[PDB]
Amino acid sequence: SDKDGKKAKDRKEAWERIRQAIPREKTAEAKQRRIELFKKFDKNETGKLCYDEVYSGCLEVLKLDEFTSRVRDITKRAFDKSRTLGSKLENKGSEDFVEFLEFRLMLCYIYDFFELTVMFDEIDASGNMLVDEEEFKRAVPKLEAWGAKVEDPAALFKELDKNGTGSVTFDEFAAWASAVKLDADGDPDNVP
């Protein structure tokens, strides 16, 4: 009852829009789109967003539900992570709200996580949003190219297969790689 109801087709079509909708690039052009986007989320104009606010905007502004029927889950992941990377770049301790910086990083995280999902769709034979060992290994060079090297594929496969079922979930695989790409990319407003 927590299985994602979207198939590869649904994701591929939603990604056409989403990949254009989320301003993830390190350009001045995207930098402004991010402000515009942040104002749509920050209805209370506090410049601090709690999870329900981020979730509402993810739902109603970004329309993430086109891509996945688990908006809750992806939103929470992005919310948590962006809060953790925010601490780092500012060299301050973490807060339990998302200020503009973290919002920017959330946008990038969701972008990366969805981009990876669409990629994994191309390799998931069962259409169950899991990858077996063989499919995992075919993803590995595409990830290196996309910006997340797997130095030890067999070790990563074992580590991410949390309960030892012999597949890795899209959520675990995509969370690993987005966390790498995010921390790599950093603040996209910091441009060049």
From Swiss-Prot:
Ca(2+) 3 binds at D161, N163, T165, S167, E172. Residues 1-13 have a biased composition (Basic and acidic residues). One of its GO terms (molecular function) is calcium ion binding. Ca(2+) 2 binds at D124, S126, N128, E135. It holds the Pfam family FCaBP_EF-hand. Ca(2+) 1 binds at D42, N44, T46, K48, E53. May contribute to the rapid motility of the trypanosomes, playing a role either in flagellar structure or in calcium metabolism. Could alternate between a GDP-bound inactive form to a calcium/GTP-bound active form. This is Flagellar calcium-binding protein.
